[PDB]
Design a protein around this ligand. Structure first.
Ligand SMILES: COC(=O)N[C@H](C(=O)N[C@@H](Cc1ccccc1)[C@@H](O)C[C@H](Cc1ccccc1)NC(=O)O[C@H]1CO[C@H]2OCC[C@H]21)C1CCCC1
Lengths: 99, 99
């Protein structure tokens, strides 16, 4: 689809069989989701944002479905204020900016 | 133009006479530029994201040119790690996400 930005570009995603709302975020290198249980192994990681750094759990090769498009890649889980879909997955679904 | 997301979507902007590189960020409500000495009145403001909040100065009705496209709105200034063009100005240049 084509999405304008008069409001936040929120979309429904599916991860681990659960539905969630997430923000299509061109300003994020990485994808960061609020605290949740995911299968598979995980390793601690740090990521930095506008206000500083937070501790996250890095899950690799996780399947996520974004508006019906499938992606499999790195998902960070931690105390982010909003579920954000970053460029690592936006590229997998073929997302571009246009103006 | 069309901007892919393999790398950070950085573009040249023109503000208050100066040229700068800024991130086109669909995940930002607002536009924040690193510390610069703009003239006129301002109001204090706090903006937040991953990691917490930073204190910025809010300037109203500032002109910014983004790859030849002009926009006028609120521009925040403070200790941001990166210059960020947010939705308040991206809507004005007709920017969309497309996949
Ligand atoms: C209403 O609240 C807002 O609008 N918050 C805006 C805001 O923080 N938006 C976030 C997404 C978001 C939206 C709501 C709540 C929490 C997070 C991103 O879009 C922009 C930041 C910019 C950034 C880039 C580099 C270093 C530091 C910062 N990317 C980000 O943190 O990315 C992380 C993940 O991936 C890693 O790559 C980059 C760095 C890592 C601010 C921005 C300026 C105006 C408000």
């Amino acid at each position: 689809p084509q999405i304008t930005l008069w409001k936040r570009p929120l979309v429904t995603i599916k991860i681990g069989g659960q539905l969630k709302e997430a923000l299509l975020d061109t300003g994020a290198d990485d994808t960061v989701l609020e605290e949740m249980n995911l299968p598979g192994r995980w390793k601690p990681k740090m990521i930095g944002g506008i206000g500083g750094f937070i501790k996250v759990r890095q899950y690799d090769q996780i399947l996520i479905e974004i508006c019906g498009h499938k992606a499999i890649g790195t998902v960070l889980v931690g105390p982010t204020p909003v579920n954000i879909i970053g460029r690592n997955l936006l590229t997998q679904i073929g997302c571009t900016l246009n103006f």
